[PDB]
Design an enzyme around this catalytic site. Structure first.
Site, PDB file in Angstrom:
ATOM      1  N   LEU A   1       0.835  -1.190   0.000  1.00 52.72           N
ATOM      2  CA  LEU A   1       0.000   0.000   0.000  1.00 52.72           C
ATOM      3  C   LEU A   1       0.875   1.246   0.000  1.00 52.72           C
ATOM      4  O   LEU A   1       2.057   1.200   0.349  1.00 52.72           O
ATOM      5  CB  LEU A   1      -0.939   0.028   1.212  1.00 52.72           C
ATOM      6  CG  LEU A   1      -1.909  -1.141   1.389  1.00 52.72           C
ATOM      7  CD1 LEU A   1      -2.842  -0.879   2.557  1.00 52.72           C
ATOM      8  CD2 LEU A   1      -2.702  -1.378   0.116  1.00 52.72           C
ATOM      9  N   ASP A   2       0.282   2.363  -0.412  1.00 52.79           N
ATOM     10  CA  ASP A   2       0.959   3.648  -0.388  1.00 52.79           C
ATOM     11  C   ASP A   2       0.715   4.342   0.950  1.00 52.79           C
ATOM     12  O   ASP A   2       0.107   3.786   1.868  1.00 52.79           O
ATOM     13  CB  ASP A   2       0.494   4.521  -1.552  1.00 52.79           C
ATOM     14  CG  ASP A   2       0.527   3.789  -2.877  1.00 52.79           C
ATOM     15  OD1 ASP A   2       0.893   2.596  -2.889  1.00 52.79           O
ATOM     16  OD2 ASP A   2       0.187   4.407  -3.908  1.00 52.79           O
TER      17      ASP A   2
END
Ligand code: SF4
Ligand code: SF4
Lengths: 113, 208, 114, 176, 82, 96
Positions: free
Chosen positions: E38-39
């Site tokens: 994920l960012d």
């Protein structure tokens, strides 16, 4: 003479201008006593404040005191004295008698390019 | 040189030069240049960090009393690293005089806002932002004032074209006023009007 | 190479401000969708916000990202109060214009533009 | 060199204060305003009967554009492009080439009447008095493209309005 | 907010409603960046999903250390009595 | 000016002035719409001798702005100008 109005909106007429102006000028000189002597600002505004204090001290009247102080009414003279006091305090805070903080670039103030 | 030449004002020139020396002597921490033009206009070019004290001095010294802020301007000169030149015009009603104070900033350096000295600047420098992107620190309410709400870019920069990058038209499919890339029916004809011969020998710059 | 900062001394405070701005926009998007009577969903608006944030995510100068956060805050206040119309909110969604060619061959077919 | 508007001290004697009380109890100044309006009712109105009557105009009036001719049939314009160089709105487009007899004449002279600010710089920059602003002003159209005049339309306007444009130039040219 | 297993299953539940996370590799000790992929903004919207469901505000300097569900459930356990 | 004397008297009474002396509508007192041709005068530089342009060129006498101070005793404090003179009350109509 009990002047009815100064003619300026929001600027009330002062009952006693002589004592007020003397108090403001003495406060200005007291504040300027903290600035170093070699600063040119202290010398210049001390000279003009001493001149204005001498005029306001050697003059019993009000109308021709206004006409020879060359500052309009006496109330705006009092206002300018208060402004000069506030400016002197800010000048003490800022200390602008120091040398230049930064040289500009080589062609910063060159016109035309 | 009598009928068609504008007469000179030497006494005003002398008085403005004396007052410029006076100001440059009182505040040596911030001022950098003091000049008087040939039509008797006094320009005081100062360091940006002294934009707050110097103006306050001119607002409050008994020998200056520049109580009126006539104008506030930004000038874009792309050939300098500090491409934005910010100009304050002050009017003194007591002594019946005008002064000009110039500072320099680039795109990223912020400026101390002069709202606390002059209230009119609360709109004026705000307009500067909307036209130039010059950020003014400690401003009460800084936002756009002239451009559209979804407008991207600063138009008065000299690298911004005359017509923008978008233009509006009504679309019946979405029932809305929509923005599309600009396509002019007539191109703006650029005219090269500069004569190749030198006009003013007094303003000739030294060569390299 | 010493410069006057705008708000952040380093990249950490700038990233913190970016995080606050993204949080505020993510909270704002459903209210924008409901109030303006837009034809888009909340997912589309939040994806658009993420699209702009990722599009403008290659900078490394603290002053530039500080100014970007400032401009995003100005747009957020223009959306919080009803100053933008439906058209100004839908400027981000380019629906009317035809989709531009991307590969070499279609650009070769349509004109001389590189 | 200055006067004090609204610095009048009203009298406090019984006669003046009773006059003021009668004024605010019997509405004297309202009756004065009514009398002003009633007197202005019986004056002859300044309304003219358009279109049967027209407002007064001077021979300097700047209306519809036209291209003039010499009193031999030859058109005055010699394609010098001063009008399109001085036009502030860039409403004038000129394209020129030498014609069959070798004269310097235009092949395209368009004036965008929706761009033009009707400033008269073209008629004052013309060295041969070719382009003029005529006296016509009742030329409103129903379509946008009808306000895009080409060379033929301007020549037709000149041939239509020459009998008035020449008289206006004759009456005005000594002031130029 | 009563038991730690209750807060644990609520945190896992709000992880389940999140769409961009695969249900397969999600566990209690699954890392958001180097494991789940994920960012940063994904972690941001996870954090305000926690704020929405639990109903209490989380400041950013606290929320930058909650990088897997274990410190998330520890953080909810710390700020409440439990 | 075509009104009857009764209507003129009614207008003068209700207005308070004598409106017939100052009528806003124009009449034969205005100038003619056609005028005799004029002969405009010439300027002072319309001469044949002692009219060299180098001795009357205003644009070429403009100098660059003189620099007072640049970064490359008991003098009196000064002002940009002498203080302004107090305005005198109007003798025509002081409204007092
Ligand atoms: S009147 Fe002025 S704006 Fe119109 S065509 Fe002539 S020069 Fe251009
Ligand atoms: S200024 Fe006159 S002669 Fe010259 S191009 Fe225009 S209309 Fe023709």
């Amino acid at each position: 003479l009990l002047k009815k109005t100064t003619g300026l909106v929001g600027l009330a007429v002062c009952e006693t201008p002589h004592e007020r102006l003397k108090i403001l000028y003495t406060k200005i000189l007291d504040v300027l006593g903290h600035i170093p002597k070699n600063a040119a600002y202290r010398k210049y505004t001390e000279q003009i404040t001493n001149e204005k204090l001498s005029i306001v001290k050697a003059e019993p009247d009000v109308k021709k005191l206004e006409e020879q102080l060359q500052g309009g009414q006496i109330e705006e003279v009092i206002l300018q004295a208060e402004n000069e006091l506030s400016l002197a305090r800010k000048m003490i805070q800022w200390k602008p008698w120091e040398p230049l903080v930064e040289e500009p670039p080589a062609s910063q103030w060159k016109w035309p390019i | 040189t009598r009928p068609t030449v504008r007469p000179r004002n030497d006494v005003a020139h002398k008085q403005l030069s004396a007052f410029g020396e006076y100001v440059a002597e009182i505040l040596p921490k911030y001022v950098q240049q003091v000049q008087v033009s040939c039509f008797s206009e006094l320009e005081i070019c100062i360091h940006p960090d002294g934009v707050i004290p110097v103006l306050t001095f001119l607002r409050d010294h008994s020998n200056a009393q520049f109580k009126s802020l006539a104008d506030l301007t930004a000038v874009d000169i792309p050939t300098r690293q500090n491409r934005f030149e910010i100009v304050y015009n002050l009017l003194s009603l007591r002594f019946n005089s005008r002064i000009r104070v110039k500072t320099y900033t680039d795109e990223l350096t912020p400026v101390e806002s002069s709202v606390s000295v002059y209230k009119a600047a609360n709109w004026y420098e705000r307009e500067i932002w909307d036209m130039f992107g010059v950020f003014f620190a400690n401003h009460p309410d800084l936002r756009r004032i002239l451009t559209d709400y979804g407008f991207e870019g600063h138009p008065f920069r000299k690298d911004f074209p005359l017509s923008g990058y978008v233009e509006l038209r009504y679309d019946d499919e979405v029932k809305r006023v929509v923005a599309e890339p600009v396509e002019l029916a007539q191109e703006f004809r650029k005219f090269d009007l500069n004569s190749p011969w030198e006009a003013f020998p007094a303003y000739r710059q030294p060569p390299e | 190479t010493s410069v006057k900062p705008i708000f952040s001394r380093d990249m950490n405070e700038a990233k913190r401000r970016v995080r606050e701005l993204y949080r505020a926009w993510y909270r704002e998007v459903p209210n924008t969708v409901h109030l303006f009577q837009l034809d888009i969903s909340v997912k589309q608006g939040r994806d658009k916000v993420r699209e702009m944030f990722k599009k403008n995510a290659h900078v490394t100068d603290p002053r530039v990202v500080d100014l970007l956060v400032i401009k995003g805050k100005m747009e957020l206040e223009e959306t919080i109060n009803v100053w933008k119309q439906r058209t100004h909110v839908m400027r981000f969604f380019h629906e009317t214009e035809a989709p531009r060619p991307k590969d070499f061959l279609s650009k070769f077919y349509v004109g001389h533009d590189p | 060199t200055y006067k004090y508007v609204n610095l009048r001290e009203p009298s406090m004697d019984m006669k003046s204060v009773t006059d003021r009380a009668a004024q605010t109890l019997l509405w004297t100044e309202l009756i004065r305003g009514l009398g002003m309006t009633l007197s202005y009712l019986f004056r002859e109105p300044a309304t003219i009967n358009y279109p049967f009557e027209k407002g007064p105009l001077s021979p300097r009036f700047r209306g519809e554009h036209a291209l003039r001719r010499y009193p031999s049939g030859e058109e005055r314009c010699i394609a010098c492009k001063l009008c399109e160089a001085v036009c502030p709105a860039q409403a004038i487009t000129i394209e020129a080439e030498p014609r069959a007899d070798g004269s310097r004449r235009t092949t395209r002279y368009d004036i965008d009447m929706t761009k033009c600010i009707y400033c008269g710089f073209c008629q004052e920059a013309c060295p041969v008095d070719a382009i003029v602003e005529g006296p016509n002003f009742e030329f409103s159209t129903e379509t946008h493209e009808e306000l895009l005049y080409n060379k033929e339309k301007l020549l037709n306007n000149g041939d239509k309005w020459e009998a008035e444009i020449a008289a206006n130039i004759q009456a005005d040219y000594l002031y130029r | 907010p009563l038991t730690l297993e209750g807060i644990k299953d609520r945190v896992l539940y709000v992880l389940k409603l999140y769409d961009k996370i695969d249900p397969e590799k999600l566990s209690v000790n699954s890392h958001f960046m180097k494991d789940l992929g994920l960012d940063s903004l994904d972690q941001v919207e996870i954090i305000m999903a926690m704020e929405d469901e639990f109903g209490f505000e989380i400041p950013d300097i606290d929320a930058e250390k909650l990088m897997c569900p274990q410190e998330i459930v520890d953080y909810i356990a710390d700020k409440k009595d439990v | 000016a075509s009104a009857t004397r009764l209507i003129q008297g009614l207008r003068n009474w209700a207005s308070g002035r004598d409106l017939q002396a100052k009528l806003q509508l124009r009449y034969q007192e205005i100038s003619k719409r056609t005028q005799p041709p004029p002969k405009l005068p010439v300027g002072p530089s319309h001469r044949l001798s002692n009219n060299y342009y180098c001795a009357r060129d205003g644009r070429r006498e403009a100098m660059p702005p003189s620099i007072v101070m640049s970064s490359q005793s008991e003098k009196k404090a000064v002002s940009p100008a002498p203080p302004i003179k107090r305005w005198e009350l109007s003798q025509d109509e002081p409204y007092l």
